[PDB]
Amino acid sequence: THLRPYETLGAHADTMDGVTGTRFSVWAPNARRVSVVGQFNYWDGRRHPMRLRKESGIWELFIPGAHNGQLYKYEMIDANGNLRLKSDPYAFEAQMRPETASLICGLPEKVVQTEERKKANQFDAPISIYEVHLGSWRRHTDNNFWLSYRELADQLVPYAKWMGFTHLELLPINEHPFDGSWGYQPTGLYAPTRRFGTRDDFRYFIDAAHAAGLNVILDWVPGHFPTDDFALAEFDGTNLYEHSTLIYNYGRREVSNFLVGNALYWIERFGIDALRVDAVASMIYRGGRENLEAIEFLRNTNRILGEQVSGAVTMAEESTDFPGVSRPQDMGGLGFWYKWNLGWMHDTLDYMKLDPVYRQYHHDKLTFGILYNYTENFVLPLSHDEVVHGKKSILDRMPGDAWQKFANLRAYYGWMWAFPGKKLLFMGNEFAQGREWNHDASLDWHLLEGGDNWHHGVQRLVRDLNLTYRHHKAMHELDFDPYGFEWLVVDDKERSVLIFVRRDKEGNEIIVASNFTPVPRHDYRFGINQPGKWREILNTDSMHYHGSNAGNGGTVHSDEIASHGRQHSLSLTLPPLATIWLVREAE
Numbered sequence: 110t111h112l113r114p115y116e117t118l119g120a121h122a123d124t125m126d127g128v129t130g131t132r133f134s135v136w137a138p139n140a141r142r143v144s145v146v147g148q149f150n151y152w153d154g155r156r157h158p159m160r161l162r163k164e165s166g167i168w169e170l171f172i173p174g175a176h177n178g179q180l181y182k183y184e185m186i187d188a189n190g191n192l193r194l195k196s197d198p199y200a201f202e203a204q205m206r207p208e209t210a211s212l213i214c215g216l217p218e219k220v221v222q223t224e225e226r227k228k229a230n231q232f233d234a235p236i237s238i239y240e241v242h243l244g245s246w247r248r249h250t251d252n253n254f255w256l257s258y259r260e261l262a263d264q265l266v267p268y269a270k271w272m273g274f275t276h277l278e279l280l281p282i283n284e285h286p287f288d289g290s291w292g293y294q295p296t297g298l299y300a301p302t303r304r305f306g307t308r309d310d311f312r313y314f315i316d317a318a319h320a321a322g323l324n325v326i327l328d329w330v331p332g333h334f335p336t337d338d339f340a341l342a343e344f345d346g347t348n349l350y351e352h353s354t355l356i357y358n359y360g361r362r363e364v365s366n367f368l369v370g371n372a373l374y375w376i377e378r379f380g381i382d383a384l385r386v387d388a389v390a391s392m393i394y395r396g397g398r399e400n401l402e403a404i405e406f407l408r409n410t411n412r413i414l415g416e417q418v419s420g421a422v423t424m425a426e427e428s429t430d431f432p433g434v435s436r437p438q439d440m441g442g443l444g445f446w447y448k449w450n451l452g453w454m455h456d457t458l459d460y461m462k463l464d465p466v467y468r469q470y471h472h473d474k475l476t477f478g479i480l481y482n483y484t485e486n487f488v489l490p491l492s493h494d495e496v497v498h499g500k501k502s503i504l505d506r507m508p509g510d511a512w513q514k515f516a517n518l519r520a521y522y523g524w525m526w527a528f529p530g531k532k533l534l535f536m537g538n539e540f541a542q543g544r545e546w547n548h549d550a551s552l553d554w555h556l557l558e559g560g561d562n563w564h565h566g567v568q569r570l571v572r573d574l575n576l577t578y579r580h581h582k583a584m585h586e587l588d589f590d591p592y593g594f595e596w597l598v599v600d601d602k603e604r605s606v607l608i609f610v611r612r613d614k615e616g617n618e619i620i621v622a623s624n625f626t627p628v629p630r631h632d633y634r635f636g637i638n639q640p641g642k643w644r645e646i647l648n649t650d651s652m653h654y655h656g657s658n659a660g661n662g663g664t665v666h667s668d669e670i671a672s673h674g675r676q677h678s679l680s681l682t683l684p685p686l687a688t689i690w691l692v693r694e695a696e
């Protein structure tokens with residue numbers, strides 16, 4: 110069992126014959142002697158030296174009297190012959206920047222994954238993710254301070270739950286030194302950032318999300334090698350972890366254990382339910398373009414998780430059309446369960462950006478997503494990458510005056526939530542923030558203060574979209590099966606009306622129709638598959654969302670009148686810049 114190196118390396122409480130303390134391990138094959146320097150030592154590297162094992166390269170020692178809560182470090186003389194005070198690379202807890210000293214804590218008890226949390230991860234479940242940067246979601250008013258893990262527990266959790274999300278997704282909670290990396294430049298892979306409290310506080314947070322029936326996804330960064338505070342480079346005077354631009358040595362067997370351990374750790378000692386790997390492209394590129402050993406790392410890691418912690422899943426963002434990212438290793442490979450649908454994000458946003466008068470020439474931007482839908486298990490993501498650095502907010506991409514911007518954005522969420530593939534939405538998007546995301550400030554919650562306005566409208570819509578999406582299997586059962594989606598009207602470019610059906614395993618279908626110009630369509634007849642009585646269950650133009658409240662205003666019965674190659678049809682009102690969903694009424 111060499112998969113969980115965190116259960117042996119680093120600081121672990123133990124008792125050597127009646128006397129208790131903590132036994133330290135590391136791993137610096139070369140090094141040149143290493144001692145342990147903590148609060149128990151008066152910080153003196155002459156009192157405690159460590160005995161090196163030759164085969165494993167691990168220096169070890171059992172200090173009695175040294176207890177949980179005490180800072181410590183490693184004083185080593187490196188291959189070159191230099192004085193170094195290194196941070197434990199298996200630090201489960203670190204100190205407030207500035208800026209290193211590891212802390213003596215052990216391992217959290219350990220979380221058995223529940224059946225219901227496993228069910229929530231499956232390809233047939235509704236999965237709607239709220240993506241959040243913990244340092245910019247909310248702040249206290251007086252002082253602009255972070256909310257702690259426990260405060261986030263009282264506030265972020267009840268909020269995402271009420272908004273009807275199934276998953277919470279966190280930007281990296283890796284200890285990281287600069288708020289500006291957003292957590293993507295780590296220096297302590299096994300310690301939750303101290304920014305928001307203790308590691309037990311982080312754990313309580315996760316327990317609370319679960320108690321509310323949310324799954325939790327963690328951004329995992331085994332692909333960004335540490336580059337700050339000399340935290341991991343030339344560990345023992347040699348290129349222990351990196352290579353001869355700093356990039357992990359996924360080939361060396363102990364580096365691999367390190368990274369795979371890290372995954373098993375989050376999932377097993379915190380109960381994390383899934384992990385997301387960013388920038389997969391820059392892990393596998395730069396023997397062909399490909400970095401063969403990096404590809405193997407991911408295949409392997411996925412296999413190991415699939416075997417060790419089945420029920421947990423992995424997702425990936427990969428920026429080139431690398432085949433089979435979310436397909437099994439015996440074949441394509443990589444072996445992720447889910448892939449970010451970046452192509453969709455770009456196509457649909459480019460579509461929404463157009464002056465509606467020009468949408469008739471870019472219809473392919475909305476239809477195209479179906480052609481490659483069954484090549485990958487997709488998540489439709491409106492993530493943090495899309496609302497920084499001059500890209501604008503999602504709202505601000507929309508054309509026209511304010512009332513047309515909101516309407517476009519409503520119609521789009523309508524479409525997004527009905528279109529095959531899971532859902533991801535970055536905080537602030539749900540209430541249509543105007544400004545870009547600022548990791549250095551709270552979101553613009555002041556937009557929701559005072560009388561009911563257009564921002565509340567969207568927030569209500571997103572909630573109703575989640576709850577409605579979760580209620581009806583057709584919207585979510587068969588994302589990844591051709592049977593789950595079928596065009597009713599794919600070729601109305603000249604009016605920019607698009608209509609499809611979603612379908613569950615039992616063959617029940619929901620009709621989804623979108624009108625992407627501001628011209629209301631009345632008596633719009635299209636062919637259908639299940640004749641009978643149809644009723645709106647969702648309408649982005651409802652006054653409940655500050656729409657004009659146009660629509661069908663009741664049950665509508667189909668006619669036996671051929672249309673679009675079908676024998677029966679519906680003749681509906683399609684509100685301007687809106688999408689609606691209809692269900693069939695039992696008789």
Ligand SMILES: OC[C@H]1O[C@H](O[C@H]2[C@H](O)[C@@H](O)[C@@H](O[C@H]3[C@H](O)[C@@H](O)[C@@H](O)O[C@@H]3CO)O[C@@H]2CO)[C@H](O)[C@@H](O)[C@@H]1O
Binds near residue numbers: 474477479480596
């Ligand atoms: O790039 C490949 C492909 O893209 C474009 O084809 C479009 C079709 O013109 C359009 O009808 C639609 O195709 C749909 C089918 O009609 C429908 O029955 C179902 O089977 O799948 C499609 C749903 O998206 O969309 C595609 C993509 O925009 C382009 O115009 C073609 O020349 C080209 O072969």
Ligand SMILES: OC[C@H]1O[C@H](O[C@H]2[C@H](O)[C@@H](O)[C@@H](O)O[C@@H]2CO)[C@H](O)[C@@H](O)[C@@H]1O
Binds near residue numbers: 411415434437
């Ligand atoms: O429909 C896509 C494809 O995905 C699944 O395979 C998963 C597998 O469950 C995991 O072990 C891991 O390796 O990810 C794989 C995809 O990368 C389905 O089981 C499979 O039937 C399906 O073809």
Ligand SMILES: OC[C@H]1O[C@H](O[C@H]2[C@H](O)[C@@H](O)[C@@H](O)O[C@@H]2CO)[C@H](O)[C@@H](O)[C@@H]1O
Binds near residue numbers: 247248249253556
């Ligand atoms: O974060 C909670 C806080 O949000 C709002 O105030 C924000 C403001 O909207 C931001 O643009 C920025 O200036 O930070 C402020 C808080 O530090 C609400 O107005 C406020 O009531 C709410 O508690």
